[PDB]
Ligand binder design. Sequence first.
Ligand SMILES: Cc1cn([C@H]2C[C@H](O)[C@@H](COP(=O)(O)OP(=O)(O)CP(=O)(O)O)O2)c(=O)[nH]c1=O
Ligand SMILES: [Cl-]
Ligand SMILES: [Cl-]
Ligand SMILES: [Mg+2]
Ligand code: NA
Ligand code: NA
Ligand code: NA
Length: 326
Amino acid sequence: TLNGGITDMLTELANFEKNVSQAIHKYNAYRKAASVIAKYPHKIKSGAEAKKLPGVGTKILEKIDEFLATGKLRKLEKIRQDDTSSSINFLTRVSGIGPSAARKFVDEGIKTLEDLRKNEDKLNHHQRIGLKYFGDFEKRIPREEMLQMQDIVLNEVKKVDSEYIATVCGSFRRGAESSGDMDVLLTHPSFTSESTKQPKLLHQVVEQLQKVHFITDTLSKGETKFMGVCQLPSKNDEKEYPHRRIDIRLIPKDQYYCGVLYFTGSDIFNKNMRAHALEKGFTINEYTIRPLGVTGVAGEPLPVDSEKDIFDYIQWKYREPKDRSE
DNA sequence: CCGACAGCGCATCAGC
DNA sequence: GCTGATGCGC
DNA sequence: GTCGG
Ligand SMILES: Cc1cn([C@H]2C[C@H](O)[C@@H](COP(=O)(O)OP(=O)(O)CP(=O)(O)O)O2)c(=O)[nH]c1=O
Ligand SMILES: [Cl-]
Ligand SMILES: [Cl-]
Ligand SMILES: [Mg+2]
Ligand code: NA
Ligand code: NA
Ligand code: NA
């Protein structure tokens, strides 16, 4: 938080470009700038000083100078008074409502939390649960609660079958004091890149976690990716815990290290690392690292026995999860 | 000093 | 229904 | 919006 005011401004600028301008490249440029400033040590005192960091060009620089001068950005002070974009920004905070849907609702005259309530029929399933738990999903999760959710999820998957391996990734694996949701990587020997012997492996896990009333709702469900809602159990007379977003991602066991690298993130770190693989002539996704040819087509998967192997290939020093919070 | 910008699962739609 | 495009979230 | 070429 040495340049919290600046990175906040940049993050709000990015939010606007994504939600209102629907210019996803402006969005990503601001958030690259926000993150490189966020880890930059000591107080930024000038747009030109900032300019030295990669991803900050002239326009961010003149914005930083204005912010440092006045404490404000006029550009944002008008965005915050513009009633239409302010309504669009707000609706995208419901999970499952993004730019298109947010602007669709606002055109129809549906502009506040109440308006969504008076209309749960114009909302797809994901959007209704996002609305149901709107206040809950804006709350972070203390690591202590994350640790309890970890023990539940793990002891339940082992109840289904003792060869499941579940790994809590996301901000938790990076060591964060709090997380926005809970991310679970799931491997089972039966499911590799060679074939799935029998699917439903993710369903059985979801089913069990539901039967014990940990998973309370579903946002999306498929054979390898579950997105839903879960809740810790409270004790007698105690206030209930908030409900929590939970994503579970089943990955071929032979592709674990690529999957755990993917799912540990952050999303910005994943994007730098993948852009850098491409410059090195490699492509990385959550399953494999593969060489880039001369034509550009991905070659065949390179062999991987650790996260560090992935790093070695693109000639990065190994970064521990803790230092991946970009 | 203009093209590329990371990559993919699931849900929903439109045109068959 | 299937295919491919888009929306959304990760 | 930014930058490597
Ligand atoms: C949103 C997003 C995510 N991920 C990968 C990396 C994430 O670390 C991981 C988990 O997604 P998410 O839970 O949204 O991010 P997080 O790092 O755990 C931050 P929070 O604690 O708020 O969940 O998915 C991406 O690779 N690209 C993305 O755009
Ligand atoms: Cl642009
Ligand atoms: Cl489809
Ligand atoms: Mg998370
Ligand atoms: Na720069
Ligand atoms: Na949303
Ligand atoms: Na997540």
